[PDB]
Amino acid sequence: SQKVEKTVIKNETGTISISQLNKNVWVHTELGSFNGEAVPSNGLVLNTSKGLVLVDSSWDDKLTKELIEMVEKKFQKRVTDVIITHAHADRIGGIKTLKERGIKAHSTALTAELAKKNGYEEPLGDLQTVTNLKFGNMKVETFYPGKGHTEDNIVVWLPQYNILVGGCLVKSTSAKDLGNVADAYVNEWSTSIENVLKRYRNINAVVPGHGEVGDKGLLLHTLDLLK
Ligand SMILES: [Zn+2]
Ligand SMILES: [Zn+2]
């Protein structure tokens, strides 16, 4: 009888929020913790018929669980697939839970090479620079403009909605710099972004590594700080 009239999906705690980009895709944002502060990591939920999908897992298995025990009933679809942009706590951080239940972490051969270097699991890694994926009525093509946020940092592209997932590689409007370039290549970063605005210019919406979806303006944003 009693119900609210909202679109997004924010749990009682308010840590995990999923905004519906349209009617077949959402943006799951898992809030972590920077030791006293909050670290909201946006994402992308694909509403397919073959199974639910989320771009980049949660910070830690502790968070991922709360994200899988909420979307599995809210979306009416069980998660069994996840796209990995690179090797980071905001990507495969919760892979431990994705490779325990039955979630295939699609990634590039390299993504499954540097992942263990940090102590993470081993994803599919059966991807490449430019490839086409199919998750049942859900087409997802990747892209490797070069080195930037990581050694295999890539950007998920969706030709079904012209949506792009710049990820950490592409800073958000609410950013002042890249921050932490130890595991990244600022020498190729500016070179990778320029490729996402020269080749994959056509974008209806871009989702950075943190914050929310926007536009191509996020691409030039990275170079505006990593310059
Ligand atoms: Zn990252
Ligand atoms: Zn990040």
From Swiss-Prot:
Location in the cell reads:
Periplasm
- Kindly state the subunit structure of this protein: Monomer.
The source's superkingdom equals Bacteria
Name of encoding gene: blm
Is Ribonucleoprotein among this UniProt entry's keywords? Answer: no
Q: Which organism is it from?
A: Bacillus cereus
Q: Which UniProt keywords apply?
A: Antibiotic resistance, Hydrolase, Metal-binding, Periplasm, Signal, Zinc
Fetch the Pfam families from UniProt: Lactamase_B
EC number(s) from the headed UniProt entry: 3.5.2.6
What's the top EC group for this one? Answer: hydrolase
Membrane-spanning segments: none
A biological process term (GO) from this entry:
response to antibiotic
What is the protein's given name? Metallo-beta-lactamase type 2
Give the note describing cofactor binding and stoichiometry.
Binds 2 Zn(2+) ions per subunit. The enzyme can also function with only 1 Zn(2+) ion.
**Reaction(s) catalysed (UniProt annotation):** a beta-lactam + H2O = a substituted beta-amino acid
- Provide the binding site for Zn(2+) 2: D90, C168, H210
Q: List the disulfide bonds.
A: none
Q: Which residues bind substrate?
A: K171, N180
Kindly list the GO CC terms recorded for this protein.
Answer: periplasmic space
| UniProt GO molecular function | beta-lactamase activity; zinc ion binding
